[PDB]
Structures are given as C-alpha cells and as structure tokens.
Amino acid sequence: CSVEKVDRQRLLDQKGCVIWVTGLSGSGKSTLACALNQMLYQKGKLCYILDGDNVRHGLNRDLSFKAEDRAENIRRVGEVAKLFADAGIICIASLISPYRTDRDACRSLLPEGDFVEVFMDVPLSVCEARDPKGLYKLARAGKIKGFTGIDDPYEPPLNCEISLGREGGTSPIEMAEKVVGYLDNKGYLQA
Amino acid sequence: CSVEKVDRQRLLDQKGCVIWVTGLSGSGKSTLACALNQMLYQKGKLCYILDGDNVRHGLNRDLSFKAEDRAENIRRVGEVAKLFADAGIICIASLISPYRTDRDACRSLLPEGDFVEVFMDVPLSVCEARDPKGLYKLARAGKIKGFTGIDDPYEPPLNCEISLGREGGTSPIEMAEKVVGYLDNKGYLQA
Numbered sequence: 001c002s003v004e005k006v007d008r009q010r011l012l013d014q015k016g017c018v019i020w021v022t023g024l025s026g027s028g029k030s031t032l033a034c035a036l037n038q039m040l041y042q043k044g045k046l047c048y049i050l051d052g053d054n055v056r057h058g059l060n061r062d063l064s065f066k067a068e069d070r071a072e073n074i075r076r077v078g079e080v081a082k083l084f085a086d087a088g089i090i091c092i093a094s095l096i097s098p099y100r101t102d103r104d105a106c107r108s109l110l111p112e113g114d115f116v117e118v119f120m121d122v123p124l125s126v127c128e129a130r131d132p133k134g135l136y137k138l139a140r141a142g143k144i145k146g147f148t149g150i151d152d153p154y155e156p157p158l159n160c161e162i163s164l165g166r167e168g169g170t171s172p173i174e175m176a177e178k179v180v181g182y183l184d185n186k187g188y189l190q191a
Numbered sequence: 192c193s194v195e196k197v198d199r200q201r202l203l204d205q206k207g208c209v210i211w212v213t214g215l216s217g218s219g220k221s222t223l224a225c226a227l228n229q230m231l232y233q234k235g236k237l238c239y240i241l242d243g244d245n246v247r248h249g250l251n252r253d254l255s256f257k258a259e260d261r262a263e264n265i266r267r268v269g270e271v272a273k274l275f276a277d278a279g280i281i282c283i284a285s286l287i288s289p290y291r292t293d294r295d296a297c298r299s300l301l302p303e304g305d306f307v308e309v310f311m312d313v314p315l316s317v318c319e320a321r322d323p324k325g326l327y328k329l330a331r332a333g334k335i336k337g338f339t340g341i342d343d344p345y346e347p348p349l350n351c352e353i354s355l356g357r358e359g360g361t362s363p364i365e366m367a368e369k370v371v372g373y374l375d376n377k378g379y380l381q382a
C-alpha cells in the first residue's frame with residue numbers, strides 16, 4: 001500500500017521502534033514500562049506496552065511456561081512488536097524473555113537501530129525479597145515448577161543498549177528519564 | 192498503567208477500532224484496505240493494515256491452510272487487531288477469514304461498536320475471472336487442495352456493518368468513501 005512507515009512517522013512526529021525490557025520476575029520491568037509510557041505520553045509521543053502477563057491472557061492464552069512455549073511466547077511478541085514499530089509506535093515489550101537466542105531473534109526481525117534491548121539488572125536476591133506476587137516462595141516450595149531464576153535459566157543480555165537498576169534506590173522515574181534521554185538523543189522522538 | 196485508551200485517542204484525535212474485511216480470494220479485500228488507508232491518512236488519521244498474506248510471513252509463519260490453522264490464523268489476527276484498537280489505531284484486517292464462528296469470536300474480543308465487519312460481496316465467478324495470482328486455476332487443477340470457495344467453505348457474514356462490491360464497477364475509491372463516511376458518522380474519526 002502507498003502509505004509507508006515514514007508517512008505514519010511524519011503524522012506522529014516520532015519513529016517506530018521496539019523497547020525490549022527483559023529481566024527476572026520482580027526486577028521491575030512493568031513498573032519501568034509504565035513510567036516510560038507516562039513520560040513519553042506527556043511529551044506527546046504514542047507508546048504501547050506489550051506486557052507478558054497481559055498478552056498471555058489474549059494472543060498467547062494458548063502458551064504454557066515450558067521452554068518451547070516461552071520461546072513461542074517471545075517469538076510472537078517480537079513479531080507483534082515489529083508490527084507496532086512499523087505502525088510508527090514506540091512499542092514497549094515487558095516480558096521475562098529469559099533466553100538469549102530468542103531475544104536475539106526478535107532483534108533480527110527489526111532494522112538495525114529499531115530494537116532497544118533494556119536489561120533490568122536486578123539480582124535474584126533482590127527480586128526474591130520483593131516477590132510482590134509470592135511466586136518465588138511458591139517456586140521454592142515446589143508448587144511452581146521450572147520457575148525462571150530458580151529451576152529454569154535466565155540468560156542476561158551480553159550487549160544491550162541500556163542496563164537499569166544496578167545500584168540501589170534508582171527510582172522508576174529516574175530510570176524512565178534515562179531511557180527517554182537515550183531515545184531523544186538517538187532521534188526516535190521526532191519524525 | 193496510568194495511560195488509558197482514551198488518552199491515546201485524545202492524542203490521535205480518533206477512536207481505536209477494528210475494520211474486519213472478509214471475502215473470497217480475489218474479492219478485493221487488500222485493494223479496499225489500501226484505498227481506505229490512503230483516504231484516512233490524508234484526513235490525518237492513523238491506520239494500520241493486518242493483511243493475511245503479510246502476517247502469514249511473520250507472526251503466523253507457522254500456520255498452514257488446514258481448517259484448524261485458518262481458525263488459529265484468524266484468532267491471532269483478532270487478538271492483534273484488538274491490541275491495535277487499544278492503542279487508538281484504526282486497524283484494518285484483510286483476511287479471507289472464511290469461518291463465521293471464527294470471525295464472530297474476533298468480534299466478541301472487542302467492546303460493542305469497536306468491530307466493523309466489512310463483507311466484500313463479490314461472487315465466486317467474478318473472483319475467479321479476476322484470479323490475479325492464478326490460484327483458482329491451480330485449485331481447479333488439483334494443485335492446491337482445500338482452496339476457499341472451491342474445496343473449502345466460505346461462510347458469508349449474516350449481519351455485517353458494511354457490505355461492498357455487490358453491483359458492477361464500484362471502484363475501490365468509491366468503496367473506501369462509503370467506509371470512511373460510515374466511520375465518520377459513527378464518530379470514529381475524532382476523539
């Protein structure tokens with residue numbers, strides 16, 4: 001069709017992209033995604049969050065947490081994120097996405113530069129002390145099998161664009177500011 | 192997150208929705224989708240087309256044309272369309288989507304009013320005379336098994352919002368005008 005990605009970007013005055021937020025359960029991915037969305041919205045930029053929990057109740061309602069289903073979960077989210085980026089949207093994906101090979105495949109779906117991998121670099125011990133949903137304790141007690149960071153591996157990014165949360169008391173707002181500053185400098189916040 | 196669908200709609204000055212375009216192969220779904228997108232873009236509205244062929248090369252690259260895979264194809268497209276609508280986008284889905292039960296399930300995913308079913312009411316004989324890709328002839332010759340309208344059923348909508356193409360020489364532009372007029376009157380082209 002005659003309407004191109006650059007036409008949609010011209011309309012929105014921004015560049016479509018994927019902000020891929022990965023990290024252990026409890027590392028603060030969703031909290032960061034919200035803070036970022038709020039901040040970008042106030043600057044007049046259009047974002048949309050694909051959160052692992054949300055998507056697992058709709059598009060991915062058929063997927064379990066077996067390793068193969070985690071890969072399919074990530075794969076589908078990567079493809080949908082690509083569609084949002086093509087629509088000119090700043091798409092924020094917030095999924096544990098534990099496997100390096102699967103996150104890398106999502107990156108390869110996109111043109112160089114359009115995929116910003118954001119690592120919530122928060123150690124297991126801190127996530128487990130947070131344990132907002134009580135999942136780690138259920139996992140430790142064997143009620144949840146194959147839980148990421150306990151009985152299934154989490155593979156951190158080797159070369160991500162942004163690493164967050166390493167240090168203490170860095171607030172979700174300050175972290176979103178760092179992401180927004182990065183996007184602004186890279187030119188994603190204007191056509 | 193604090194940013195709501197109504198906030199995104201306020202930013203874009205339009206209402207998110209799904210325009211579900213269904214019909215036989217060759218009925219002119221993609222041609223209509225493009226014309227519509229072009230017309231809405233010129234009015235400053237943001238649309239995005241989910242075309243069956245396109246999506247089958249990415250998100251749905253794992254699906255065949257067996258009946259169960261057509262249902263899954265439609266199901267996933269409905270879920271993605273819902274996400275686009277929630278982002279405030281006018282999402283145009285252009286898929287054969289032959290099964291009534293599966294299109295109806297996509298409709299039920301959305302709030303009343305947010306799903307506009309558009310039937311390309313073009314008889315098999317006309318689609319087959321067009322046969323732009325030579326698919327009908329391959330189907331007739333047994334090279335393609337289970338082809339919609341030949342060896343697999345197409346179930347027309349019983350109560351769609353818009354029916355197009357019934358009559359001769361109605362142009363894609365005139366048809367898009369009818370859809371745009373409908374969207375405009377229903378209030379989808381303003382926040």
Ligand SMILES: Nc1ncnc2c1ncn2[C@@H]1O[C@H](COP(=O)(O)OP(=O)(O)NP(=O)(O)O)[C@@H](O)[C@H]1O
Pocket residue numbers: 023024025026027028029030031032053095096120130132169170171172175
């Ligand atoms: N920057 C932060 N500093 C301190 N606490 C935080 C921070 N961000 C999030 N939290 C808290 O840590 C808990 C988990 O955050 P959350 O954003 O839900 O994690 P997640 O990575 O989205 N979890 P999951 O959905 O299971 O993968 C929440 O209760 C937050 O309040």
Ligand SMILES: Nc1ncnc2c1ncn2[C@@H]1O[C@H](COP(=O)(O)OP(=O)(O)NP(=O)(O)O)[C@@H](O)[C@H]1O
Pocket residue numbers: 214215216217218219220221222223244286287311321323360361362363366
């Ligand atoms: N309104 C129209 N009037 C006359 N011819 C048309 C019209 N719309 C489309 N066509 C032609 O019919 C052919 C098929 O149109 P197309 O939009 O590709 O069909 P479709 O429903 O998208 N096919 P498919 O992708 O296999 O499901 C094209 O070559 C068009 O040129």
Ligand SMILES: Nc1ncnc2c1ncn2[C@@H]1O[C@H](COP(=O)(O)OS(=O)(=O)O)[C@@H](O)[C@H]1O
Pocket residue numbers: 025051052053056065069070071073074094095096097098133135144145146147148
């Ligand atoms: N075995 C598990 N491992 C990790 N998260 C789980 C598990 N079981 C349920 N969950 C829940 O599902 C959410 C994670 O889903 P995803 O982000 O979609 O995971 S992913 O690995 O497939 O990317 C977590 O919030 C967690 O609450």
Ligand SMILES: Nc1ncnc2c1ncn2[C@@H]1O[C@H](COP(=O)(O)OS(=O)(=O)O)[C@@H](O)[C@H]1O
Pocket residue numbers: 216242243244247256260261262264265285286287288289324326335336337338339
């Ligand atoms: N057996 C088939 N029936 C219909 N379309 C087919 C078939 N095999 C290949 N195709 C192609 O795939 C396209 C249709 O895909 P979809 O729109 O995604 O179909 S759907 O039934 O699953 O909704 C058509 O353009 C057609 O070219």
Ligand SMILES: [Mg+2]
Pocket residue numbers: 029030031051053094
């Ligand atoms: Mg979360």
Ligand SMILES: [Mg+2]
Pocket residue numbers: 220221222242244285
């Ligand atoms: Mg088509």
